[PDB]
Amino acid sequence: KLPEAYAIFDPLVDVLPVIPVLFLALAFVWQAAVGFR
Amino acid sequence: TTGERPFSDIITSVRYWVIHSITIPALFIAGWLFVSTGLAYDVFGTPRPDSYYAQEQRSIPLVTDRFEAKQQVETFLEQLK
Amino acid sequence: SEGGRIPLWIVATVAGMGVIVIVGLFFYGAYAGLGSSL
Amino acid sequence: MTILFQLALAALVILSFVMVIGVPVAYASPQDWDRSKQLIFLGSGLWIALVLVVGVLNFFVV
Amino acid sequence: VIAQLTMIAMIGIAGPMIIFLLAVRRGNL
Amino acid sequence: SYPIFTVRWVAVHTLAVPTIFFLGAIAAMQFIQR
Amino acid sequence: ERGWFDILDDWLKRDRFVFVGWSGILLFPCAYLALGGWLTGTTFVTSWYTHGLASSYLEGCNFLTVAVSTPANSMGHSLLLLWGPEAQGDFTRWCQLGGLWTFIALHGAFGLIGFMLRQFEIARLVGVRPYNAIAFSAPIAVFVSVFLIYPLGQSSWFFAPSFGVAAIFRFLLFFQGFHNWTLNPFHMMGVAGVLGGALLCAIHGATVENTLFQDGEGASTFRAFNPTQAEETYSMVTANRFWSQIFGIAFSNKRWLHFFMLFVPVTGLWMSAIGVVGLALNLRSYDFISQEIRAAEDPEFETFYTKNLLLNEGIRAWMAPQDQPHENFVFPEEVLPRGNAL
Amino acid sequence: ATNRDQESSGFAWWAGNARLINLSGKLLGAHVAHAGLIVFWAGAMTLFELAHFIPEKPMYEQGLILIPHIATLGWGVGPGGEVVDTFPFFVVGVVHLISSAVLGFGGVYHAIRGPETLEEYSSFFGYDWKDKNKMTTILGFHLIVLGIGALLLVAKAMFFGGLYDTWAPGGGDVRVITNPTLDPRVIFGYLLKSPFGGEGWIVSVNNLEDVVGGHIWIGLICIAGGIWHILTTPFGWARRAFIWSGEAYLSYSLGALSMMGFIATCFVWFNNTVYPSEFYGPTGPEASQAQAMTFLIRDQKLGANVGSAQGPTGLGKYLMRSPTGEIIFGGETMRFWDFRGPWLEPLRGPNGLDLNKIKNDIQPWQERRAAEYMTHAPLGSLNSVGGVATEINSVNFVSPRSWLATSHFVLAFFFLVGHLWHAGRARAAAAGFEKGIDRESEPVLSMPSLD
Amino acid sequence: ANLWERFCNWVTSTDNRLYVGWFGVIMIPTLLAATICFVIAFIAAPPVDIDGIREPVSGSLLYGNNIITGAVVPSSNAIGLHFYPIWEAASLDEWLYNGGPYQLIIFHFLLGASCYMGRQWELSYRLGMRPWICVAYSAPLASAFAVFLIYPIGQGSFSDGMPLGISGTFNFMIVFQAEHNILMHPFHQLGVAGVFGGALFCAMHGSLVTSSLIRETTETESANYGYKFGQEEETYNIVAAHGYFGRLIFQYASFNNSRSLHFFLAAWPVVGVWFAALGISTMAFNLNGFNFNHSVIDAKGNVINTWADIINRANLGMEVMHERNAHNFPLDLA
Ligand code: CLA
Ligand code: CLA
Ligand code: CLA
Ligand code: CLA
Ligand code: CLA
Ligand code: CLA
Ligand SMILES: CC1=C(/C=C/C(C)=C/C=C/C(C)=C/C=C/C=C(C)/C=C/C=C(C)/C=C/C2=C(C)CCCC2(C)C)C(C)(C)CCC1
Ligand SMILES: CC1=C(/C=C/C(C)=C/C=C/C(C)=C/C=C/C=C(C)/C=C/C=C(C)/C=C/C2=C(C)CCCC2(C)C)C(C)(C)CCC1
Ligand SMILES: CC1=C(/C=C/C(C)=C/C=C/C(C)=C/C=C/C=C(C)/C=C/C=C(C)/C=C/C2=C(C)CCCC2(C)C)C(C)(C)CCC1
Ligand SMILES: CC1=C(/C=C/C(C)=C/C=C/C(C)=C/C=C/C=C(C)/C=C/C=C(C)/C=C/C2=C(C)CCCC2(C)C)C(C)(C)CCC1
Ligand SMILES: [Ca+2]
Ligand SMILES: [Cl-]
Ligand SMILES: [Cl-]
Ligand SMILES: [Fe+2]
Ligand SMILES: [Mg+2]
């Protein structure tokens, strides 16, 4: 467990580790926006 | 090209989404209710979690006769009280 | 009415996200309720 | 102190979200760059300050 | 549980929102 | 300019219509408990 | 000659997004019903009354474990028509009796016929030789030998493969334990044709891509090709030298090369089909008689062949009671074959 | 949009990052941002593990891979690897996560806002890949940085609390290292050991003195090498041996990393010193040996003479000889006789496992540990069902040793593939035929026929 | 030119009937040694105690085997991963009893085949070709490494490496299924998609090109005489082949670019086989196939079997029977 003062951020902490993966997907959203030129 | 409207045209048009923002969720909700009301179980004859066995029984209701298979299935179903 | 008003990259992004959500739900279901072994 | 802690931390999260969206938009936007740049400086300094505040207040609530 | 999903909704939208905002403002994509 | 209801439209919907219905059904299934 | 037949022929052969044809009349409903039947079964339909198994998403199975399972052994080789004497028009009972299995097998067979007819029809319209259809004869022989001839030789449809991922894996393991199918030279030729075909696919694609002519300025080389161009896009001469010096031999004739690419996997699949026809009758390559006479007389004689048979015996004894429920096997613990400790 | 389409850059979108080869500012951005992603993962994953961490359950029952890395360094743990304080883990997590914001900030700036090339802006930060001296200088800076890192491990071990030592007298505990091994015969001795059974190359390192001294050597070597490369330029023979281009240097690094990945796979699979079984679970060998120990103990309590008990094959049911005569455990675990672990060594004499010690000296803690390790063997399914392939659902377990080994084999393999790809391509491009054969100058056409 | 330069020129010469090269300098002796040892052993080697339990298994033709049953048998479980060259044995008779030939052969072979890959790179460079045929060959090579080296390392013994024989190969597969449930592993599944897919696309491409051959011959001669080695023009009409296949499915499901098509032909089986290899290489460290044993349970708690449970019964049969005299304790932990 995180120290009690931080407990309210538990749902946030659960989600953080996947964020790097979102960067790979973002590259595709970006490329789609410029027509994969 | 063979004459039909290009898909890219269609799925980027406003009218397409006016139509499908209704038709798609409607279909999805219909399928949900097919399961959630229990209708699927009755249509396909699939056992609910409490209907594989009677309370004390531990033997599979295996069909063993070709031409009275239907009645056998019915008897199996009755034996679930 | 006519093609182009909603950019293809937005349609693709939203469509793809939808796919991710539904498949995600299906993986959730592997751990809860029927089929979960519990 | 717990109030001050929780609010300072909320401020850090909120500001971080604001910077995460706003910094790349500002960097790649054609116009209003001077105001943008000033704002990015300000946001950065405040971000650093907030990290320090949460860091210190951590020990008076934990 | 709803909280987790909310978080990943905001976080998840952050990326496409940046592209959208830049596209609207004709930024340097 | 373009027709709406073609052989293509028909094939497309024979696949897409049940797919969405089936996906809603399987979604509901994820909340069934023994 | 412009009567209704010719008018219909006109409409059927229109150049549209999805080509129809006369063959389409057979192909489209049959392929659609087969696919729809599979999706319908794997989503909603049990195998409790035919196999004692759950087999659908509705019951809690996943994509790997769902199936449309074969009918009970007591059905024999019944066509199991919906209006037939077993189901008697009752759709629910029909599903509970395994009717979807024959629905899918039969509509699937007629759809495969429809597809090969489509290959012929299109080839004829476009003015090309019909080698694609001919090559499709191999998928046909496999489907017909495995899903039809094989169970027809056995006691019932129950022993056909069930349509599911895990169900198919079970089919493989059944064939190892009961048929010693890996020992069969027809399966071995099948394996060589499949792996050899995969080899040819890889090596040919790679060779073409690494003997390209520089026909553009880009470092990404795909754009430097034009479908209408007359020139070879890669050097056969350089490819030939490379392979001659690496492997000893090389293709020099492009026509022979591509024919061979048809020949290898198509022939492999045909050979496997022949082996399965024998397995329909339990006409296995199960044993080597000389091996068995020697091993029976000499308790120190051991080969990988005898080692595999002990594995087969384990498979049979441990899987049969649950895999063959109509037999009502009760094998007491003391008769189960087991090595030390395990 | 300088160089940002296929027509100007010569590269398609799916090879878009190759557009960065000669754009040093933007490339600097890509690199710094990527570092940000790494550090981000370390921090976020650490906080995630901590949030999901129950202190009285072993770490390895909880799907943890980073907390074990921290605890091995001596933070947060006491005797036997028990967690006494989770605050260090929290600190490592938070500080990495905060740092990742800084790195990401720099990365984004250089990538989309800063100067696209650095050369006109600064002679110091600008570079030409084909400038051999500049390359060796930057290589040097980075070598000095690595050396400092190794020395930071040394400092932790010697002056800031020590390291967790599974081998500490009296039971595993955090211990300060006061006498690191400096003797180069020992240190480089590991380097010359066979990688086969009973030897295991550097993977055989089995005490913290050797680990620390080894890191002293690596620190000094890296700093010295860095200075060398700042002060010198490549010799003639090197100049003639190598391809000098960005893609070539990349390919070299890809080969190096593949090699390191395979090595790390073996380290986490076999080594139980720098990967303590307290934190990572038992090794495969360890758990197998532990089963043998467990049933020896059970049967001997029942009255069996385990030394003289002949098994079905004629070999000892519990105990047998290795091919060089050592007394070892029997059954299939005969393969694992090179195994060494603190719970087993007290029963070891000069000739191997000692029957007298086995009969009289086995302690309850050894029985416990052998039972624990036997029932936490690194076997389990992809969906984390613990045990052999035929085991029923009930136990949620896949050993961290398996997760680490498998991930790093996959990564090392694809990195070898990347080495081949980029090395072959660098060769072709340096020579000028990476885009295909010149139709008017096809080399094979000027060669004599083979026959 | 000095002798070393001349030697180098001959080694790297593009005019040799078979290319030698620096990789070849290692490849030739290593492959010759593995080959010669393999042939002699396959014909004449005595039985080998594969499982280290003094239970020798006969693999050679002269000792009671045919082509299907014969094998060179893996080295002893007593050896494990220890290096066992000829000179570690007191005698050749000892060397043979313990399975020395297996190690000599697999090590020389893995080295030689790695060098075969390098040599493909090298010749491609000498000829001014693009370099990636060797990357295609990395897929079968990685697979060999998986079954001969990585699996043994993970399990702690060369006794668990794939035997050099037909039936021995089958043995390896069956035990692998018992121990790792490989059929339920997604990397093996990708492998199967890779080889089925490879065979499919092989047939498909063969058939499309053959179907669009441009008429150049009469009915009484092989159409193959319509192509001449090194002619500049393409021998089939890709436009017609594409018209056909495009109408078979739909236009945008067919390749019109020969380069993309051939890259696809390369990438599909190569990637799938890469995953096949990674499957074996990761199941080497016991991260196994999906386990859905008793996943489906009714309202009371009765186990409702699925096809997964039938697979489980099959696997149990294999498990309890394999190496029937080698286990003394209840769990097979490697
Ligand atoms: C068009 C392609 C096509 C083909 C080749 C098939 C083929 C089949 N269907 Mg499928 N089916 C199709 C489309 C098709 N179907 C469509 C579009 C639907 C949705 C309505 C179905 C719904 C369906 C169901 C629900 C079932 C089948 C079944 C079958 C199988 C048995 C059919 C049979 O005995 O018919 C017999 C009829 C004929 C062969 C017609 C021949 C007409 C002759 C030549 C003319 C003379 C007729 C005469 C004048 C009529 C007098 C009648 C009077 C004496 C009473 C067979 C494999 C059964 C099955 O799969 O069991 C496992 C089954 O239960 N089909
Ligand atoms: C580690 C992942 C990674 C990184 C760091 C990069 C980095 C880069 N890419 Mg590459 N790329 C990648 C993966 C990556 N790429 C992948 C997976 C693909 C295949 C889809 C590509 C395909 C590709 C192509 C085809 C091209 C690049 C180009 C570039 C460069 C300029 C991009 C640009 O102009 O954006 C403009 C984009 C925007 C203005 C939108 C916003 C972008 C920002 C960076 C997002 C920031 C979000 C973040 C959460 C903010 C945190 C802020 C906070 C710290 C305060 C840049 C250095 C280009 C190049 O080489 O130029 C010469 C180029 O043409 N990339
Ligand atoms: C070194 C890499 C590594 C390793 C060894 C682990 C190991 C673990 N993680 Mg961690 N993690 C990682 C990276 C890693 N992770 C990354 C990058 C993220 C961000 C997404 C996370 C975020 C994360 C979360 C949120 C959780 C874990 C959890 C776990 C545990 C359970 C894992 C599991 O069930 O996987 C399931 C298996 C898979 C998902 C299979 C992945 C197959 C991939 C896609 C194959 C890719 C092959 C190759 C890379 C592609 C090449 C393509 C080719 C064509 C070139 C296990 C200890 C769980 C835990 O127990 O925490 C306490 C958990 O809840 N991890
Ligand atoms: C890979 C690391 C790296 C490198 C080689 C560069 C290089 C450069 N940066 Mg960039 N930058 C980076 C990362 C890097 N940066 C990071 C992390 C940030 C976020 C803080 C930035 C934010 C940034 C901005 C806003 C600007 C630059 C600018 C520059 C240019 C001028 C630098 C200078 O004159 O400083 C002089 C050197 C000093 C003043 C001393 C630095 C003292 C250091 C930081 C102490 C710590 C050192 C220690 C080794 C850190 C280890 C960290 C480790 C744990 C990861 C130069 C090309 C400028 C530019 O391009 O203008 C056109 C510019 O305006 N950088
Ligand atoms: C010679 C290089 C080397 C080796 C063999 C090790 C080994 C180890 N380190 Mg150390 N370390 C090193 C350098 C090295 N380290 C450097 C440079 C740093 C600073 C970044 C550190 C900082 C560090 C920390 C903070 C910790 C460790 C820890 C460890 C132990 C566990 C980690 C592990 O499995 O790594 C496996 C190692 C490798 C896969 C690297 C293999 C290197 C090969 C043999 C050489 C490659 C050479 C290169 C390709 C040649 C260049 C070309 C040239 C010929 C011109 C292990 C004994 C942990 C520990 O001891 O816990 C108590 C730990 O916490 N290391
Ligand atoms: C990342 C680390 C790194 C890298 C990439 C380089 C790169 C280079 N070094 Mg430098 N160097 C380094 C660190 C590094 N160095 C360190 C830490 C030191 C201090 C020890 C040095 C001291 C040094 C000297 C004294 C010299 C170089 C030289 C060079 C250049 C040619 C080297 C070469 O040919 O390698 C390939 C190696 C060879 C050709 C030698 C034999 C090759 C055999 C096959 C090696 C077999 C190893 C095998 C894989 C076994 C591994 C395990 C084994 C250790 C047990 C090249 C630019 C040379 C130069 O030109 O300086 C200006 C040179 O004279 N370096
Ligand atoms: C730490 C932290 C933080 C951070 C955050 C971040 C950093 C974020 C990021 C984020 C991001 C970064 C996001 C992104 C996203 C993305 C996405 C969501 C995408 C998707 C995609 C898709 C879906 C795709 C699709 C497609 C296309 C586009 C084309 C082709 C086809 C396809 C379909 C594939 C915060 C602030 C919270 C605060 C607290 C703490
Ligand atoms: C049988 C029968 C019939 C018929 C029916 C039908 C015709 C049906 C159809 C149906 C259908 C038609 C259905 C559908 C479904 C679908 C689905 C269910 C889908 C799903 C999908 C998904 C889930 C996805 C996935 C994926 C992939 C695939 C890859 C990529 C990734 C992902 C993951 C996304 C009739 C009445 C005649 C008669 C009686 C009997
Ligand atoms: C260039 C480029 C790219 C990339 C980019 C990148 C990769 C970036 C990165 C970035 C980054 C790398 C970022 C990061 C950030 C971070 C942050 C922003 C953080 C924050 C944190 C916080 C706020 C914390 C909080 C807390 C505390 C303090 C205590 C405990 C609890 C919690 C967690 C709540 C792409 C691909 C798109 C494409 C285009 C170009
Ligand atoms: C820390 C530590 C330690 C130590 C370590 C060490 C001390 C290491 C060293 C290491 C080393 C000292 C390494 C080295 C490496 C090297 C290498 C890796 C090399 C490579 C080479 C190459 C790659 C080359 C190539 C080539 C050829 C061969 C021919 C000509 C051309 C060329 C140049 C390409 C110990 C274990 C004690 C313990 C634990 C901790
Ligand atoms: Ca209930
Ligand atoms: Cl066996
Ligand atoms: Cl055992
Ligand atoms: Fe071709
Ligand atoms: Mg569920």
Side-chain angles (χ1 to χ4, degrees), chain H residues 20-32 106-120 125-127:
Chain H
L20 291 165
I21 294 171
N22 302 308
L23 296 175
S24 55
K26 276 183 157 55
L27 188 51
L28 174 66
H31 282 123
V32 175
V108 169
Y109 165 77
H110 283 293
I112 66 179
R113 191 71 201 189
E116 187 155 306
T117 56
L118 299 174
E119 293 69 47
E120 29 277 291
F125 295 104
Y127 60 87

Side-chain angles (χ1 to χ4, degrees), chain H residues 136 139 143 191 201 221-222 225 228-229 232-235 237-238 242:
Chain H
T136 57
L139 162 63
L143 282 169
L191 229 51
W201 195 47
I221 290 163
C222 280
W228 165 261
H229 282 307
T232 62
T233 200
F235 293 128
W237 63 267
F242 290 102

Side-chain angles (χ1 to χ4, degrees), chain H residues 29-70:
Chain H
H31 282 123
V32 175
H34 183 271
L37 290 174
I38 298 188
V39 174
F40 188 104
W41 178 82
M45 195 68 247
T46 300
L47 294 177
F48 183 101
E49 283 187 8
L50 176 57
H52 291 237
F53 185 32
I54 305 165
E56 61 267 5
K57 220 176 164 201
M59 292 177 187
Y60 52 79
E61 280 183 10
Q62 309 182 61
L64 308 185
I65 60 177
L66 296 195
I67 289 183
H69 280 87
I70 303 159

Side-chain angles (χ1 to χ4, degrees), chain I residues 236-313:
Chain I
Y236 71 112
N237 185 324
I238 201 175
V239 178
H242 179 56
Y244 171 81
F245 184 55
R247 293 168 177 87
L248 182 61
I249 314 298
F250 49 90
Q251 180 180 0
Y252 310 110
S254 183
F255 287 101
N256 69 339
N257 186 316
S258 178
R259 298 186 166 194
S260 316
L261 168 65
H262 289 90
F263 167 72
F264 182 80
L265 296 182
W268 185 278
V270 163
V271 173
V273 171
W274 276 340
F275 283 102
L278 291 175
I280 302 295
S281 297
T282 55
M283 281 173 278
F285 307 100
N286 311 316
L287 185 63
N288 299 330
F290 285 114
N291 183 336
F292 300 120
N293 301 334
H294 302 188
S295 277
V296 183
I297 298 298
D298 84 350
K300 184 189 190 183
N302 296 303
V303 175
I304 308 302
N305 280 351
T306 70
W307 280 112
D309 298 287
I310 307 305
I311 289 167
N312 199 36
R313 301 298 305 185

